[PDB]
Amino acid sequence: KMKKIVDAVIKYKDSSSGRQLSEVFIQLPSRKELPEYYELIRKPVDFKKIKERIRNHKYRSLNDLEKDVMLLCQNAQTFNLEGSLIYEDSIVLQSVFTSVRQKIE
């Protein structure tokens, strides 16, 4: 299941450096930096967090992961509004994620 998860993630990577719009959700600031985020969202997760975790075999089910991803998108919209770069990025991502997802299914 592991393989599948890795293969699925690796498969979908932008460029060799891994740069893309989601790059905004790769690294999470500090609490201090953004205490609001902490209060607003109980737990901001980023791509590194997932990546790091899975490294140790944290996840085992694709549902779990998917859920996380979907959740992350929402969390961003909760904080962000319409009419912004972030908003745009969240739509694109979702679209792309859906496609992978659909396929994979």
Curated annotation (Swiss-Prot):
Highest taxon in the source lineage: Eukaryota
Protein's recorded name: SWI/SNF-related matrix-associated actin-dependent regulator of chromatin subfamily A member 4
Region of the whole protein represented: 1461 to 1565 of 1647
Organism: Homo sapiens
Record's subcellular location: Nucleus
Annotated disease: Rhabdoid tumor predisposition syndrome 2: A familial cancer syndrome predisposing to renal or extrarenal malignant rhabdoid tumors and to a variety of tumors of the central nervous system, including choroid plexus carcinoma, medulloblastoma, and central primitive neuroectodermal tumors. Rhabdoid tumors are the most aggressive and lethal malignancies occurring in early childhood.
Tissues/organs with expression: Colocalizes with ZEB1 in E-cadherin-negative cells from established lines, and stroma of normal colon as well as in de-differentiated epithelial cells at the invasion front of colorectal carcinomas (at protein level).
Family listed: Belongs to the SNF2/RAD54 helicase family.
Self-association state and partner proteins as the record states: Component of the multiprotein chromatin-remodeling complexes SWI/SNF: SWI/SNF-A (BAF), SWI/SNF-B (PBAF) and related complexes. The canonical complex contains a catalytic subunit (either SMARCA4/BRG1/BAF190A or SMARCA2/BRM/BAF190B) and at least SMARCE1, ACTL6A/BAF53, SMARCC1/BAF155, SMARCC2/BAF170, and SMARCB1/SNF5/BAF47. Other subunits specific to each of the complexes may also be present permitting several possible developmental- and tissue-specific combinations.
Effect on the protein upon substituting residue 24 to A: No effect on binding to 'Lys-15'-acetylated histone H3
